[PDB]
TrEMBL record, chain B:
<dbReference type="InterPro" id="IPR001360">
    <property type="entry name" value="Glyco_hydro_1"/>
</dbReference>
<feature type="glycosylation site" description="N-linked (GlcNAc...) asparagine">
    <location>
        <position position="378"/>
    </location>
</feature>
<feature type="glycosylation site" description="O-linked (Man...) threonine">
    <location>
        <position position="26"/>
    </location>
</feature>
<dbReference type="InterPro" id="IPR017853">
    <property type="entry name" value="GH"/>
</dbReference>
<feature type="disulfide bond">
    <location>
        <begin position="375"/>
        <end position="387"/>
    </location>
</feature>
<keyword id="KW-0479">Metal-binding</keyword>
<feature type="glycosylation site" description="N-linked (GlcNAc...) asparagine">
    <location>
        <position position="244"/>
    </location>
</feature>
<keyword id="KW-0732">Signal</keyword>
<comment type="similarity">
    <text>Belongs to the glycosyl hydrolase 1 family.</text>
</comment>
<feature type="modified residue" description="Phosphothreonine">
    <location>
        <position position="21"/>
    </location>
</feature>
<dbReference type="GO" id="GO:0005975">
    <property type="term" value="P:carbohydrate metabolic process"/>
</dbReference>
<feature type="modified residue" description="Phosphothreonine">
    <location>
        <position position="3"/>
    </location>
</feature>
<dbReference type="GO" id="GO:0046872">
    <property type="term" value="F:metal ion binding"/>
</dbReference>
<keyword id="KW-0106">Calcium</keyword>
<feature type="glycosylation site" description="O-linked (Man...) threonine">
    <location>
        <position position="21"/>
    </location>
</feature>
<dbReference type="Pfam" id="PF00232">
    <property type="entry name" value="Glyco_hydro_1"/>
</dbReference>
<feature type="glycosylation site" description="O-linked (Man...) threonine">
    <location>
        <position position="25"/>
    </location>
</feature>
Length: 542, 541
């Protein structure tokens, strides 16, 4: 049951409709005479940068970069021995209900186009490329046999990136759970510890393979967001005895923390044995400490604390703090979240060299209107377990009725331009979750208003709100370094391309380049925001 | 026929479905101590104003205001003896094809809500209110009997505006052609001169009635755009002998120029009589002088000049220039455009005290791809008569492939944020079309990216691209006064409310206030752009 089981799994994934194949299935050669599209006019970036950041530079060695993830950009879902993820299965069986009639078969075809992508990032003065490794390219069944062609693919991607002057930053796991492990024992809902062994075997292989060339690592991308998806399809089809939709989240939380700790131990041992280069390893946190709706009101103060504990604290306190879950989380979820043993704390405590925040926005916290005490006691309460008002007319709105900032578009309504709150977030995170190597802004970006292929190219490429958000956000990071003394190591924008955005597929556009999904070649065009990003780097790096 | 003909015309308009009646049919006011919604947070306008306008002020008496039009804001289409317009007919008989399933029966109900509207403009520091008079409120048949209740309505509107400290600026005609004149002789396609007499009697009545209180007047709003609409429904149903869909445009152009000249002579004589206050009269021009796609290319340079001649020059050269049509226009359209006589030039030449430009944006001019020369000599050519590439991938795009600026929603894709080109436009207009009283920016605004009946109120009210456009555009007007010495008299944003935008009805949002079309009260909410506008006034008046 090797390539034999691989076939079986793809046959199960493809029962209703097959994996589609890209128009281009060969590594692209950047041609000798390749012409970038002309620059926008000279006045186009006028008015974006304020005089307040005149003369401010990021520290020496600042990582000024872009971020993508394997399943969101690569395509080639079955190429060169790749096994299926939970998402391959979800989008081929539940496309209309869970996947917005898209699938990750092809996405941006970055699997074959990366050389061309890197020549275009080099044109913009980008100096860092954040990627994820597809677990099922390396172990198509999550455990057992190794796919050499997959290990060779990322060698070639890392080598290309360095030639184009992009420092490679690697993420081991960006939500693409191997389907085989889900079917065998329920993957991250495993009540045993085989998920931890299988993850650690995988992390060991990619660290040995790449960590002479990759010296900044993230084990997990946004583990809090990933564990919340384990409450639904396709994970809820395979729960072990004792797991339901509520407990699966907290089972996943604990297994991810274990996987992380054990993986960072192998990373440090490989460094200590001289097998790889001395580098830095952490994981990507997300979300925010919200502002209370009514300053000095203890209920809104409490609900904002509960938000931070469940969205950030539940992973960051064990790793960068006192080595245990927030007491607020323990008191609320009880036995559903397995106790960290002395042995667990042995690996997890101190297992972050660097902090990384996906600092997209900051929220407002209104205490649950039915009362924090009532909400805590009822797991069926829609606001459980944070027990603030979680919906859009509360999360983003002052008591005044006015928003915290610009909204992104109803499909991405969690996203606001909240640049003025960035310094407070960084101050909180570096004091509460201190790391020796400091802190990354590891993801930030805009899903732009009209552009959802409503349009002609000239309307798409002048992306004023994206350009505003990225300049806002970069400006505030500069001031964090210069006014708050933040040890900020980098800024990585999501993303360098419109890509496949999970349940929303290619309808959500996060790129500073447009990808033409009606063109066989999936041709990239720079938006104004890509030139805004380039111009900010030339002006504020050195 | 009097009362009798009014009835007949409404029965013709209402054949398929009647005029709808607002849930509010009484005057809406607010007490002095009424609480407006709370301001945005203190950081909300950070970043919009550039350091290069720090401490610069507009001239003393600068009109800092908003613009609406009777049919786009009032509703009350049949209240107090109003007669039907061509648009009342068009949207009741061809709603699905010509009107996007809307009609001007109700729009924002400004006819009854103006006191509330004025209290809210006062909260923003607005000092000027630009409005149009509905001809068919005054003469329900365009000619014959006068409707006192309609004259009384605008007295009460003008009085309310002045009490709330808004200088009232009056437009006599904003496209709302009386249906009766269209049916009788074809209105603006008249090959007689009854349209000129009927307009002049109307203009005379409103000038005597209001021009003690109103001291800035525009005869016609965007006459070039209005004459363009005379090529289609419902005007093309009633053309006199010898008028086409092509020739209708140029017949309308000529009759409007005559109407204007005769009406300005009445206005000056009224001023000289002392029976109204000494004021200023002009008309609102629109459109732009575009930048050639390939500067120094003779074809794009020519097509840019043809654009200016046919979109601005055809009205402004007779009035503010040498008193004749542009030579490029005459050589192209021939006898479809009636020759101006010595007598016509007698009234028309010098008939603008003030220039007014609806300066929403600047285009790019690409010469017709089939050849400028081939296009001019056709008439069936879709790019005739300007003979540039008229469509969006040409009018807004450099040969580079990058736009001239930020685009508005595809529904309003004619609109770009082209603030950098504003000073060049004002320079060209004041030098080419000089007026003694100077120049108004009489309309500018943004149709914000798909905010329409899709969203929650917090999402609507933080309108970043509207806010950006209005601050951009106010900044450049301020700099035109300082850097170029432009005698700029005012800046009037379109509009103070989401309103009824002709063919698009209430789907296109131009307001710095949201109007809730799912609320019986049509409740107004300030957008951030309204506070941006208020803050700019406080900082730079
Ligand atoms: C697995 O989780 C999915 C994701 O929520 C559940 O989804 C919905 O559940 C409701 C309750 O019946 C259904 O009516 C919805 O229509 C479901 N949506 C879809 C896409 O199926 C689902 O109930 C769960 N399935 C199991 C077996 O527990
Ligand atoms: C999901 O399983 C958890 C246990 O993992 C359930 O939570 C407990 O429910 C029992 C009753 O079955 C109560 O006596 C306990 O107080 C609850 N425990 C905790 C830790 O709160 C939960 O009820 C199940 N959820 C669903 C949807 O059936
Ligand atoms: C817990 O909150 C939930 C949902 O907000 C409530 O669940 C309902 O309970 C009633 C009454 O017993 C049932 O008839 C409904 O069918 C339940 N489901 C939903 C989705 O509303 C419940 O009211 C809350 N429990 C407590 C003790 O406050
Ligand atoms: C996306 O790609 C398609 C595929 O080429 C583009 O479509 C072409 O548009 C040009 C002129 O603009 C025409 O000559 C061709 O007829 C089109 N080809 C096809 C096969 O449709 C499309 O314009 C691109 N879209 C954007 C927004 O850039
Ligand atoms: C008046 O103009 C309209 C178009 O503005 C004409 O009606 C349209 O004509 C086209 C071409 O024949 C049709 O295919 C459309 O479906 C028509 N539109 C509607 C809503 O009916 C109309 O014929 C013109 N009238 C005259 C007298 O020439
Ligand atoms: C009425 O429009 C017709 C088309 O509906 C136009 O046709 C031409 O008339 C011109 C006058 O400019 C003559 O010089 C030509 O012989 C006609 N031929 C062509 C190919 O256009 C007409 O121009 C309009 N009529 C008038 C008198 O202006
Ligand atoms: C004048 O312009 C018209 C309108 O574009 C031209 O008509 C098109 O030209 C060719 C004739 O070979 C046809 O394939 C198209 O079907 C015509 N359009 C329409 C709407 O029927 C016309 O040929 C031009 N005449 C000259 C002398 O240049
Ligand atoms: C426009 O006004 C309407 C009418 O009051 C509002 O309608 C309410 O809409 C909310 C939408 O979340 C509903 O839950 C309410 O029950 C509705 N009431 C009625 C009578 O329909 C609507 O919210 C307003 N919209 C905006 C953006 O302000
Ligand atoms: Ca700015």
């Amino acid at each position: 049951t090797g390539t034999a089981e691989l076939d079986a799994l793809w046959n199960l994934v493809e029962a209703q409709y097959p994996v589609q194949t890209a128009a281009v299935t060969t590594l692209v050669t950047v041609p000798d005479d390749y012409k970038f599209e002309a620059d926008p006019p000279s006045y186009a970036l006028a008015g974006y940068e304020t005089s307040e950041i005149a003369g401010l530079k990021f520290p020496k060695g600042f990582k000024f970069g872009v971020a993508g993830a394997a399943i969101q950009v690569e395509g080639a879902a079955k190429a060169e021995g790749r096994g299926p993820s939970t998402w391959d299965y979800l989008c081929h069986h539940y496309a209309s209900t869970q996947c917005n009639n898209y699938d990750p078969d092809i996405t941006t075809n970055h699997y074959y186009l990366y050389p061309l992508d890197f020549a275009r990032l080099q044109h913009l003065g980008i100096n860092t490329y954040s990627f994820s490794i597809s677990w099922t390219r390396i172990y198509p069944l999550g455990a057992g046999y190794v796919n050499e062609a997959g290990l060779a693919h990322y060698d070639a991607v890392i080598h290309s990136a360095k030639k184009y002057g992009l420092e490679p930053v690697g993420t081991v796991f960006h939500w693409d759970t191997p389907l085989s492990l889900m079917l065998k024992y329920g993957a991250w809902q495993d009540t045993g510890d085989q998920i931890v062994k299988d993850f650690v075997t995988y992390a060991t292989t990619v660290f040995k393979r790449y960590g002479n060339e990759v010296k900044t690592w993230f084990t997990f991308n946004e583990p809090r967001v990933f564990c919340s998806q384990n409450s639904g399809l396709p994970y809820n089809l395979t729960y072990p005895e004792g797991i339901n939709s509520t407990s699966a989240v907290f089972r996943c939380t604990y297994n991810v923390l274990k996987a992380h700790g054990h993986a960072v131990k192998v990373y440090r041992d490989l460094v200590a044995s001289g097998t790889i280069a001395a580098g830095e390893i952490g994981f990507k946190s997300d979300d925010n400490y919200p502002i209370p709706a009514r300053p000095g009101n203890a209920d809104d103060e409490e609900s904002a604390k509960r938000h931070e504990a469940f969205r950030i604290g539940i992973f960051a306190q064990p790793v960068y703090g006192n080595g245990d879950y927030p007491d607020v989380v323990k008191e609320t979820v009880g036995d559903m979240l397995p106790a960290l043993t002395d042995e667990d704390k042995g690996y997890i405590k101190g297992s972050g060299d660097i902090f990384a925040i996906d600092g997209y926005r900051t929220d407002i916290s209104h205490a649950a209107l039915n009362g924090i005490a009532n909400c805590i006691r009822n797991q069926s309460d829609p606001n459980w377990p944070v027990c603030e008002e979680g919906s859009d007319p509360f999360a983003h709105v002052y008591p005044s009725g006015f928003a915290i900032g610009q909204s992104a578009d109803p499909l991405s309504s969690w996203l606001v331009n909240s640049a003025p709150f960035i310094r407070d977030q960084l101050k909180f995170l570096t004091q509460t979750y201190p790391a020796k190597g400091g802190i990354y802004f590891s993801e930030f970006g805009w899903a732009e208003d009209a552009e959802y292929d409503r349009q002609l190219l000239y309307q798409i490429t002048w992306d004023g709100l994206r350009t505003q958000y990225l300049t806002d956000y970069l400006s505030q990071l500069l001031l964090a370094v210069h006014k708050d003394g933040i040890n900020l190591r980098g800024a990585l924008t999501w993303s360098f391309v419109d890509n496949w955005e999970w349940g929303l597929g290619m309808q959500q556009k996060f790129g500073f380049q447009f990808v033409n999904q009606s063109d066989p070649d999936l041709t990239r065009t720079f938006k104004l925001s890509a030139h805004a990003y380039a111009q900010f780097g030339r002006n504020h790096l050195h």
